[PDB]
Design a protein around this ligand. Structure first.
Ligand SMILES: Cc1ncc(COP(=O)(O)O)c(/C=N/[C@@H]2[C@@H](O)[C@@H](O)O[C@H](COP(=O)(O)O)[C@H]2O)c1O
Ligand SMILES: Cc1ncc(COP(=O)(O)O)c(/C=N/[C@@H]2[C@@H](O)[C@@H](O)O[C@H](COP(=O)(O)O)[C@H]2O)c1O
Lengths: 442, 439
């Protein structure tokens, strides 16, 4: 065509896939359109010139000796430039004395509203609190059943249990690690009120199919997107979307925080009431519901968030590049049936990078990677919900079998992946994996 | 032979220091206890200290047209900001903002300060109370006897975790729960007493403990406004604190703490505070559920700096309270207002006087309109008078005579550590002028 298609840089997952192809190419010109959003701020300087990803984004030093590769060194999750930006904003915020309530809260919620294309955003004190408040705002009563997967971080089930709800675990798709929509309908009872899909590891659940089931059975859908910021069409089919801004997330602040996003005004109002003591919105000390929590995000953290968010599109792109590099360079191990690699799909933001290895070999693979090559791997998370050793599980969740969740749980292995990870470290992870796995198979 | 004046920063010793420094000498040698809370005291405490000049930099003639009740920009000093920026310069590059090493250090210093074996730092005072109740074994429907004049957070912590507030009347002089009204409210469903050290005044904890022991009840105290009280926690199973930035000691965000001497109880608090996980074993739950309610490492680093100001600030608050009580004496002597008692068991988070029910609205308006003096009433609506379905279904018809009367009379005057004596002069002269014009 004589007509150049524009590449809209929104920083979202689907658009990042296109950007990946383009930034791998030679011509990087006017067709690359940076959307005027805070999330793209760090792209502005970077894209002034033609980019070589390996050198310009990763400072690839193939010849730098690597003797150990930590899975997630938290000191490297925040860059020197971020620290400088944060110290700068705190120099202005601290003398204001406004650390809990304050003006940065509304600005941060407004920026999120625009980014998520959701009318209302209520910033909370954590992702866990976002889920708990969202459930209550949606009308959860004690005993109401909430269909959910058993392989999320414990926060998901805790938010349900703390709100008085009853988790009903259903099996996952063992390739995507997300709730299998084909298993949801089987679990529905007259007590079911909610479906709580989790976009685990940053992979988008099958939300259209989930919404079809929810509509058929008049269920509400609250999605745990705490690991999924940047996903294209996040929240399209959900009544409530929840986010975490914990410092290890794709976008985080410097403490605990999260958010609830919704298009529904009455639901938003109820979220605000539950997030702040049950008070009438913007009228302190006057309760209009039975009770509420002390769970708004702090103004100080919102100010920090407005700085760290400037790095989000670039960071999510770097995560995608890393994931693409693992998938391509480890290809042979999957072609020969030794491992499973995730699919390079547009509906993933690569918070964690899961491969699957043989159940019988995983412990040895992890040990050998660490002992022989100093490569640290991990398994998020070590214990499934229905296998936790608690009185509730012992008393009520006995006899529950989730065949696919249990099998995938025994196979999954997470490889290091975060935006400041180096390609030379990634080289060592991959070479170590090739060496160890060929030792496993004989 | 020299008697020593020990400076601990706690309320009883502050009262002794006040008397000593006002020329009623309690001894010879000033001895500052080597505690974190006393660090900033060391910069200004000298043998011949002039409190008005050395601590308040009294500028009698400074031009003032407004006296805000609580300007939050003044609740944090330039020196605090400097200390905080310096600590954050070191914390930020560590990348440790939630879990981290300053947490344990902050808990340890609080443990030493409070003389409590175990301290669990939480994400707010509200969460401290909620977690404490759950750790003490609160089940849905269990009743918690408490006053109705606290901030809504107190009842909210009970209600959130399944509990049932049972409101009893206060002592209308102290604003604290009346221990003589507790026994009559006890039912087979009562498991807790939750006294509140309202405005910084210590509840009658020995009497509350006597009742609790008699009825086998647990005592969890809301001391969210009471940090610095002598013998805080002596008769409580759990003590809760808030480090909200407006408190006598606060951080730069939400935070709180639970303190207890009981190890198994502390273990349950830690479990509930962090996802129900085994203590220090992430991802392995040992109780049914938990919250994400630990204090952030970043705020703990900040608290380790701001706490250096606590003893000095609490003393400044006491000096201000004493100045109000002394200078407004005539208005009480002639029956126009009631002043709080100058007692050792107060840390003066808020300064409540009482005025006539019929005149309070006019007094507040005239102070503001005529003199630019802002006052306030903490808090505007009592628990059993909130317009919620629960109140209509359960607390309708409830009559708390002393609480409701005191609630209609209380007026809080500006009082915070960085408040100036020249502003306080304006508050006091304004009050005289407004009362006198009413007569
Ligand atoms: C799917 C999902 N839903 C919900 C949540 C809840 O989101 P917050 O409530 O915002 O955490 C999470 C959070 N997960 C991380 C967890 O991966 C681990 O790294 O531990 C950190 C905690 O580690 P620290 O305590 O060290 O911060 C948690 O933040 C989550 O992953
Ligand atoms: C007796 C008692 N128990 C318990 C609590 C609960 O303590 P947190 O959960 O730590 O707040 C409190 C807290 N009270 C203050 C409140 O006075 C008001 O200033 O509003 C601020 C909040 O105002 P901002 O939202 O602007 O910070 C609250 O911190 C309390 O006072």
């Amino acid at each position: 065509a004589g007509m150049q298609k524009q590449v809209k840089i929104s920083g979202k997952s689907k658009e990042n896939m296109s950007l990946l192809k383009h930034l791998k190419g030679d011509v990087q010109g006017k067709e690359l359109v940076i959307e005027d959003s805070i999330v793209n701020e760090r792209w502005k300087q970077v894209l002034k010139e033609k980019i070589d990803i390996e050198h310009d984004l990763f400072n690839y030093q193939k010849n730098r000796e690597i003797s150990k590769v930590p899975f997630l060194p938290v000191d490297r999750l925040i860059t020197n430039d971020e620290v400088e930006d944060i110290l700068n904003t705190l120099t202005e915020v601290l003398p204001t004395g406004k650390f809990t309530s304050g003006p940065y809260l509304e600005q941060f919620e407004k920026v999120l509203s625009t980014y998520l294309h959701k009318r209302y955003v209520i910033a909370t004190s954590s992702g866990t609190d976002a889920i708990m408040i969202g459930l209550l705002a949606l009308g959860l009563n004690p005993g109401d059943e909430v269909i959910m997967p058993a392989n999320s971080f414990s926060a998901t089930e805790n938010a349900v249990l703390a709100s008085g709800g009853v988790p009903i675990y259903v099996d996952i798709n063992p390739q995507t690690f997300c709730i299998d929509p084909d298993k949801i309908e089987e679990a529905i009872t007259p007590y079911t009120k909610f479906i709580l899909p989790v976009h685990l590891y940053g992979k988008h659940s099958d939300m259209q199919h989930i919404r079809q089931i929810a509509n058929r059975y008049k269920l509400k859908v609250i999605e745990d997107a705490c690991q999924g910021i940047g996903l294209t069409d996040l929240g399209k089919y959900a009544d409530i979307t929840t986010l975490s801004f914990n410092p290890y997330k794709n976008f985080g602040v410097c403490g605990k925080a999260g958010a609830i996003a919704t298009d529904n005004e009455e639901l938003a109002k109820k979220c605000i009431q539950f997030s702040y003591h049950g008070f009438e919105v913007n009228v302190k000390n006057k309760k209009v519901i039975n009770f509420g929590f002390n769970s708004k995000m702090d103004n100080l953290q919102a100010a920090i968030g407005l700085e760290r968010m400037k790095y989000l599109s670039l960071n999510n792109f770097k995560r995608l590049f890393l994931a693409d590099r693992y998938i391509t360079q480890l290809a042979e191990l999957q072609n020969k049936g030794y491992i499973e690699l995730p699919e390079l799909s547009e509906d993933h933001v690569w918070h964690l990078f899961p491969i699957k290895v043989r159940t019988e070999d995983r412990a040895d693979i992890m040990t050998k990677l660490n002992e022989d090559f100093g490569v640290q791997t991990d398994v998020y998370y070590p214990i499934l919900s229905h296998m936790q050793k608690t009185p509730l599980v012992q008393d009520k969740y006995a006899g529950l079998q989730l065949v696919h969740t249990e099998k995938a749980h025994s196979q999954v292995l997470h490889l290091p992946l975060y935006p400041s990870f180096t390609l030379e470290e990634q080289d060592r992870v991959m070479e170590g994996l090739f060496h160890v796995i060929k030792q496993e198979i004989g």
